Amino acid sequence: SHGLFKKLGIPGPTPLPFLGNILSYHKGFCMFDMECHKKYGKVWGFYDGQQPVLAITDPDMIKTVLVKECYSVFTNRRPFGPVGFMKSAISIAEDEEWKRLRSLLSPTFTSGKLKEMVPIIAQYGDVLVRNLRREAETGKPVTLKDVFGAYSMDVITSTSFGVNIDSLNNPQDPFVENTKKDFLDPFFLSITVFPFLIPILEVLNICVFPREVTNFLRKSVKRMKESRLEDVDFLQLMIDSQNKALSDLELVAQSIIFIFAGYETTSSVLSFIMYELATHPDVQQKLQEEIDAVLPNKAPPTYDTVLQMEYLDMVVNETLRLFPIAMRLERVCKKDVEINGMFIPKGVVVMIPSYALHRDPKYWTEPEKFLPERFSKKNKDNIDPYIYTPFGSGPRNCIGMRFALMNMKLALIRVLQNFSFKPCKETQIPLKLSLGGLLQPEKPVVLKVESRD
Amino acid sequence: SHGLFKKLGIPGPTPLPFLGNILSYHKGFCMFDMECHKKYGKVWGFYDGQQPVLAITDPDMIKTVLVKECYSVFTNRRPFGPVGFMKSAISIAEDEEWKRLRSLLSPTFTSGKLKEMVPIIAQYGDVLVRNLRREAETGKPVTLKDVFGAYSMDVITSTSFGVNIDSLNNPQDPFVENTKKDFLDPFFLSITVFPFLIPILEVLNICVFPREVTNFLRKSVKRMKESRLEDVDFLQLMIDSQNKALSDLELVAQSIIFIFAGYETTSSVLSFIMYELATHPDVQQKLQEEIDAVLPNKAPPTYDTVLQMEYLDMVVNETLRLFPIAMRLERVCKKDVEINGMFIPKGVVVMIPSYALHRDPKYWTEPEKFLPERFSKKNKDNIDPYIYTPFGSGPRNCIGMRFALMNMKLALIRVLQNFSFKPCKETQIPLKLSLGGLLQPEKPVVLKVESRD
Numbered sequence: 080s081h082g083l084f085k086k087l088g089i090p091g092p093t094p095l096p097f098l099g100n101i102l103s104y105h106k107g108f109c110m111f112d113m114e115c116h117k118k119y120g121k122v123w124g125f126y127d128g129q130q131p132v133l134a135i136t137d138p139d140m141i142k143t144v145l146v147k148e149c150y151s152v153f154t155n156r157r158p159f160g161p162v163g164f165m166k167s168a169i170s171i172a173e174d175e176e177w178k179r180l181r182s183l184l185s186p187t188f189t190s191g192k193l194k195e196m197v198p199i200i201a202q203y204g205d206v207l208v209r210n211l212r213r214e215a216e217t218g219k220p221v222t223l224k225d226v227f228g229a230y231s232m233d234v235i236t237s238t239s240f241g242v243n244i245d246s247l248n249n250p251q252d253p254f255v256e257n258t259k260k261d262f263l264d265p266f267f268l269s270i271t272v273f274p275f276l277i278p279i280l281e282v283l284n285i286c287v288f289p290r291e292v293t294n295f296l297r298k299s300v301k302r303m304k305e306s307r308l309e310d311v312d313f314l315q316l317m318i319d320s321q322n323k324a325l326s327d328l329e330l331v332a333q334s335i336i337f338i339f340a341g342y343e344t345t346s347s348v349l350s351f352i353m354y355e356l357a358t359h360p361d362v363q364q365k366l367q368e369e370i371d372a373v374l375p376n377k378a379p380p381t382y383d384t385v386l387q388m389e390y391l392d393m394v395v396n397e398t399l400r401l402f403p404i405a406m407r408l409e410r411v412c413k414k415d416v417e418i419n420g421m422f423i424p425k426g427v428v429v430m431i432p433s434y435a436l437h438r439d440p441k442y443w444t445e446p447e448k449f450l451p452e453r454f455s456k457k458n459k460d461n462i463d464p465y466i467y468t469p470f471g472s473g474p475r476n477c478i479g480m481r482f483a484l485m486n487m488k489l490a491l492i493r494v495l496q497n498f499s500f501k502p503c504k505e506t507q508i509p510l511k512l513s514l515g516g517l518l519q520p521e522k523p524v525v526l527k528v529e530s531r532d
Numbered sequence: 533s534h535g536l537f538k539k540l541g542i543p544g545p546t547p548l549p550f551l552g553n554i555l556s557y558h559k560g561f562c563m564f565d566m567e568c569h570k571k572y573g574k575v576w577g578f579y580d581g582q583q584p585v586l587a588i589t590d591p592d593m594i595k596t597v598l599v600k601e602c603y604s605v606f607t608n609r610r611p612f613g614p615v616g617f618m619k620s621a622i623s624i625a626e627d628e629e630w631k632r633l634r635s636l637l638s639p640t641f642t643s644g645k646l647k648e649m650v651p652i653i654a655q656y657g658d659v660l661v662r663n664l665r666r667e668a669e670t671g672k673p674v675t676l677k678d679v680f681g682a683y684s685m686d687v688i689t690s691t692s693f694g695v696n697i698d699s700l701n702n703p704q705d706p707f708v709e710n711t712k713k714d715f716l717d718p719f720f721l722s723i724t725v726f727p728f729l730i731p732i733l734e735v736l737n738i739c740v741f742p743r744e745v746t747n748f749l750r751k752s753v754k755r756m757k758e759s760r761l762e763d764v765d766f767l768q769l770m771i772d773s774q775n776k777a778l779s780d781l782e783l784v785a786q787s788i789i790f791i792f793a794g795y796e797t798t799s800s801v802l803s804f805i806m807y808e809l810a811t812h813p814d815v816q817q818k819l820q821e822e823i824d825a826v827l828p829n830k831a832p833p834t835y836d837t838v839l840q841m842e843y844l845d846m847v848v849n850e851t852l853r854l855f856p857i858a859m860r861l862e863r864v865c866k867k868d869v870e871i872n873g874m875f876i877p878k879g880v881v882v883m884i885p886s887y888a889l890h891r892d893p894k895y896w897t898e899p900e901k902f903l904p905e906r907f908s909k910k911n912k913d914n915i916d917p918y919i920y921t922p923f924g925s926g927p928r929n930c931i932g933m934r935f936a937l938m939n940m941k942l943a944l945i946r947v948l949q950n951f952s953f954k955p956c957k958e959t960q961i962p963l964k965l966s967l968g969g970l971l972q973p974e975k976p977v978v979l980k981v982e983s984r985d
């Protein structure tokens with residue numbers, strides 16, 4: 080299998096037998112993508128075990144894969160097992176089972192439903208404030224991934240099930256635990272070298288999702304379903320949709336995938352944002368000023384005031400450019416095709432190296448720097464929406480994007496209304512990224528929180 | 533997985549864990565199909581390991597699967613590994629790779645090409661006669677599977693490569709051996725219980741085709757290709773087609789599958805025919821008379837005289853009804869569908885129990901008896917072409933049917949022109965079928981050959 084890219088005349092590193100190029104992952108997906116872009120140029124290939132991965136960087140080519148030829152050729156992401164019943168999760172389903180779930184859950188993430196979810200997301204920003212203030216009156220450095228992880232979990236439970244917990248002070252509630260539990264850890268590298276073992280593990284009901292987590296949430300949902308039936312969150316929006324319609328095991332899968340999609344992403348991004356704010360105190364100050372110009376007297380943000388804050392949107396987008404937590408985007412080529420002059424054989428995984436593209440000098444001036452002005456209403460027109468893809472692009476992009484941006488912004492407004500964030504001596508400057516398989520700091524971000532009082 | 537047919541309300545035997553119903557194969561596919569038709573009626577289900585197989589017997593339903601919904605829903609047969617490069621063999625390829633090979637090789641089996649192949653198939657009938665006459669002048673019972681196996685091989689080599697051998701007297705020629713080498717033998721039952729092992733064996737290049745056979749024929753073809761290039765058989769018909777076009781490894785796969793398709797089928801059917809002729813000497817006598825009425829003075833049969841013999845066609849079809857060497861027909865349901873009022877879930881293998889249908893009293897009077905008159909020009913109109921399916925039906929039926937019928941008939945004319953076949957004391961009467969996984973006699977058919985001289 081290791082003669083395909085050599086046969087198509089596509090450059091790339093030379094693969095060892097069995098392993099492919101996976102030894103190149105010793106410095107992380109992102110460093111390997113960067114080195115590969117620099118070495119081989121616009122298009123290259125490599126092998127995840129025996130799996131040919133063809134990396135592309137042409138905006139027209141990226142556009143054709145993610146948007147134009149989605150329903151026909153590039154419909155699925157690369158397979159993932161063992162998954163068990165999570166096969167029905169939208170992000171894992173394939174072909175016509177996805178296209179059906181994508182429709183049942185699309186009206187769940189409309190602007191109308193999202194503005195309604197704002198008051199509930201607003202109540203736990205206040206919870207975050209009081210909890211941050213307890214840590215601000217003491218004088219001890221704050222770990223963001225904990226205080227934000229507690230907040231991100233607070234929004235999920237309330238916006239997906241109506242379960243109302245202060246998870247930071249209730250870290251030992253049974254509903255809070257099922258969730259805090261890396262494609263370069265020993266198991267998945269083994270899966271990439273021995274993918275012939277996935278069908279073994281699937282017949283043994285061994286699931287990459289912990290079987291106790293999914294067993295707890297499955298019965299926890301069926302309790303909520305028959306307590307409301309009969310006597311604003313995602314579950315209620317999915318129950319109303321099954322009233323082709325959403326099944327009862329399908330509905331529990333999506334609820335899990337919503338948490339598993341929304342938890343460490345929301346938490347880890349606010350951490351990258353607050354890091355950048357504290358190491359560029361000017362940007363934090365201007366953001367604090369725009370916040371107080373729109374919401375004077377520490378006013379509670381609303382849906383419309385959040386869309387009014389332009390410098391806030393710039394800080395978010397610039398952070399996501401720096402740290403695009405997907406790192407990559409991937410589609411499985413289900414048929415032989417020629418797009419933009421390049422023949423792609425069936426079965427190849429086409430990959431768009433997001434992190435690398437977001438840091439390419441040929442598209443960004445001083446790409447390593449934190450310059451929110453790249454996205455000002457003046458310059459935001461010069462950015463190719465296929466070079467900047469933090470939520471991906473096309474019919475299979477992030478279905479929760481609007482919710483994510485609105486969630487993270489409501490947090491930042493309330494937190495910056497009341498506090499200022501200054502680096503510590505133990506704050507890692509410059510921040511270094513984890514050489515693992517997840518986009519995250521090598522050491523958790525720790526900052527000093529002060530009160531505007 | 534073992535709750536599907538119970539959920540759809542479809543009757544059938546109860547499956548043990550892991551095994552499914554495979555213990556019911558202890559008396560052969562055919563006895564199990566018969567018992568199942570009698571017990572459960574028109575539609576039933578069972579499990580090959582974990583694989584749901586839904587058996588159908590409604591002619592309209594059979595018609596929809598094999599003909600109407602072929603290109604959309606029921607395009608492939610149930611998977612088969614480990615196969616290696618024989619994935620490209622027409623009978624194994626899937627979806628759009630099959631539909632392309634089916635077209636490249638369809639004009640190879642036209643009536644025009646087949647009438648041209650008749651003189652070459654005629655030369656080795658004479659070889660068979662002299663060889664049978666050597667065994668007729670002695671006085672020793674003749675094993676048909678050897679004398680016919682030698683003949684069937686003779687037609688293949690000459691009609692597929694131009695290789696001209698008297699295989700019966702040259703049993704030790706290297707080209708003759710690569711070919712004489714059961715889905716109920718230990719390996720394939722293991723594959724049916726542990727199908728998660730096929731991807732293991734495929735990455736070990738272990739192939740159900742012997743790797744020495746395919747390595748011999750691969751290089752043997754590339755010798756013929758460049759000796760004709762540049763300086764009437766199947767290879768030449770496939771070389772002219774690649775002049776989307778047929779590849780060089782694709783072309784060797786089909787050549788193998790033509791032998792492997794045409795060898796034990798042609799050989800074993802003539803054996804079933806000569807058995808029935810010898811145990812019904814009246815039918816053999818009438819067939820001998822029709823043969824001599826069309827070809828007087830032991831004339832050499834031609835293409836048109838073969839299509840003129842009506843009682844010969846009746847003997848063939850009635851034998852194939854009795855012994856339909858496919859036993860079953862199978863299609864993999866690639867999408868959820870409802871046909872003829874029955875919902876079929878995606879992935880289920882739909883199976884048509886040919887052998888059972890060919891022996892159903894509700895469609896055949898005295899079905900166990902050898903009555904060639906069922907197919908006379910009077911009664912041949914009352915036979916549902918979906919109840920009688922010796923070559924299957926629809927766009928994925930036997931591509932070599934015309935060649936097979938013409939091949940077996942030319943053999944029978946020449947053999948019956950010169951000899952008469954009478955049972956032995958060691959001839960198994962009534963013939964008993966192998967309880968294994970292939971349709972064949974439990975003991976090889978042995979008959980006494982006499983000369984009309």
Ligand code: HEM
Nearest residue numbers: 169170337340341405469470471472475476477478479483
């Ligand atoms: C900062 C927050 C987030 C970022 C940066 C992000 C990014 C992404 C990206 C890049 C993709 C793949 C898009 C593609 O393949 O082109 C994706 C998919 C997805 N996201 Fe997110 N995401 C975020 C938050 C969320 C949230 C809060 C949810 C809540 C439900 C969510 C649900 C999903 C789902 C279901 C998919 C799979 C979509 C599909 O396969 O149809 N995401 N996200």
Ligand code: HEM
Nearest residue numbers: 622623790793794858922923924925928929930931932936
């Ligand atoms: C008495 C002789 C034969 C009988 C009874 C027979 C019967 C069958 C049957 C029942 C099928 C499956 C049809 C279906 O799925 O509906 C089949 C397929 C096939 N046969 Fe035969 N066959 C015979 C001889 C031959 C010969 C001589 C060849 C020579 C090339 C051949 C080539 C094929 C191929 C390639 C397929 C697969 C077709 C496809 O998948 O497109 N067969 N045969």
Ligand SMILES: CC(C)(C)OC(=O)N[C@@H](CS[C@@H](Cc1ccccc1)C(=O)NCCCc1cccnc1)Cc1cccc2ccccc12
Nearest residue numbers: 156157158159170171262336339340341344404405409477
């Ligand atoms: C690794 C491999 C090459 C084999 O398969 C990919 O190609 N890797 C995608 C699968 S990881 C997986 C992680 C996970 C699974 C189940 C439950 C929770 C997490 C996954 O399916 N999560 C789906 C959506 C979760 C999500 C996370 C972040 C943002 N939004 C949604 C990685 C992947 C798939 C789909 C969307 C993604 C979005 C961002 C980052 C990775 C995403």
Ligand SMILES: CC(C)(C)OC(=O)N[C@@H](CS[C@@H](Cc1ccccc1)C(=O)NCCCc1cccnc1)Cc1cccc2ccccc12
Nearest residue numbers: 609610611612623624715789792793794797857858862930
């Ligand atoms: C057993 C399983 C349920 C997993 O898979 C089926 O469903 N079993 C079909 C595969 S057996 C296989 C045997 C074979 C393979 C490779 C080389 C030679 C023989 C096969 O692929 N041979 C394809 C065509 C050969 C042929 C034989 C007889 C007549 N014409 C053609 C069985 C099967 C598939 C396709 C056509 C068949 C025709 C008659 C009988 C069986 C046929």
